[PDB]
């Protein structure tokens, strides 16, 4: 059971989904989203063509 939860929904291309990990670099992880170091959560992604 969790005391607080957040969502953080967006849309990127399929080659950039790897950049939504904590210690990643790239166009998205540098200028767009930037997950933290001590994340404590799950990352969910799915094709939506």
């Amino acid at each position: 059971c969790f005391t607080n939860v957040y969502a953080d929904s967006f849309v990127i291309t399929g080659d950039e989904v790897r950049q939504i990990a904590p210690g990643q670099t790239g166009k998205i992880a540098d200028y767009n989203y930037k997950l933290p170091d001590d994340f404590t959560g799950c990352v969910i992604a799915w094709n939506s063509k």
Partner: protein, 48 residues
């Protein structure tokens, strides 16, 4: 960004001497499906 690359069996090593390594230039130029670093972290490549 070259016309032809080498074959996997003739893989053509080349060296990169004095220059500044700024991977930012390729952000809209190319999209990388794999980028995995060993012995170094990708967030420290700017400070090395």
């Amino acid at each position: 960004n070259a016309t032809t690359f080498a074959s996997v069996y003739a893989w053509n090593r080349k060296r990169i001497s004095n220059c500044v390594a700024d991977y930012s230039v390729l952000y809209n130029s190319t999209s990388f499906s794999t980028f995995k670093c060993y012995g170094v972290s990708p967030t420290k490549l700017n400070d090395l």
